[PDB]
Amino acid sequence: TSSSTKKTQLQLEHLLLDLQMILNGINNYKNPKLTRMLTFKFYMPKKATELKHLQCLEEELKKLEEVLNLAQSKNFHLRPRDLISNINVIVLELKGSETTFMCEYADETATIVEFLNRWITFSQSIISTL
């Protein structure tokens, strides 16, 4: 692979790992607020096959932050503000130069777990196809 491909694969892995960390940290037998967190409704991408589709993740990060404020502080090195800001920086760069592309959402909302599963899968998939 090229150097550009490799650094994109690296940004995507860093994105992956932070999304993974959030999901593991909230979705476990020990989190007494998981039930409450699952009541929130995340918008989902209609299609997520290309880096520009990360726009759909970006637009949900404020919501993600709000839900993460219910999590166990002890499960995260960073405060949710700082973790989400890091994800935001990576997403902004990975999605590419913003055209007239606002992203297209599915009608069905999803729990935080479904939402994070979608984006982790998306990231794993794109790494594999670069």
Residue numbers in the entry: 23 to 152
What is the paper's account of this structure, in its own sentences?
The IL-2 compound with residue Pro65 replaced with AzK and pegylated with a 30 kDa mPEG, hereafter referred to as THOR-707, exhibited higher expression levels of the precursor protein and was selected for further characterization. The proline residue at position 65 in human IL-2 appears to impart a significant bend in helix H3, a region that mediates substantial interactions with IL-2 Rα14,15. As the sequence of THOR-707 contains a substitution of this proline to a lysine-like residue, we reasoned that this modification might result in a distinct helical conformation that mis-aligns residues critical for IL-2 Rα engagement. To elucidate the tertiary structure of the THOR-707 protein component, the crystal structure of the human IL-2 variant P65K was solved at 1.8 Å resolution. The lysine residue incorporated at position 65 was selected to mimic the effect of the AzK substitution of this position on protein structure, as lysine constitutes the majority of the backbone of the AzK residue without the excessive hydrophobicity of the un-conjugated azide. Surprisingly, the structure of the IL-2 P65K was remarkably similar to that of rhIL-2. Structural alignments show that the lysine substitution for proline at position 65 did not result in large-scale changes to the IL-2 tertiary structure, including the conformation of helix H3. Consistent with the above biochemical and ex vivo data, an inspection of the P65K region in the structure shows that this modification occupies a region of the IL-2/IL-2 Rα interface that mediates productive interactions. The similar stepwise and minor reductions in potency of PEG size variants in both CD8+ T cells and Tregs suggest that PEG polymers are not specifically required to prevent IL-2 Rα engagement, but may impact potency in THOR-707 via non-specific envelopment as observed with other pegylated cytokines. Together, these results suggest that steric effects mediated largely by the substitution of proline 65 with AzK result in the reduction in IL-2 Rα engagement by THOR-707.
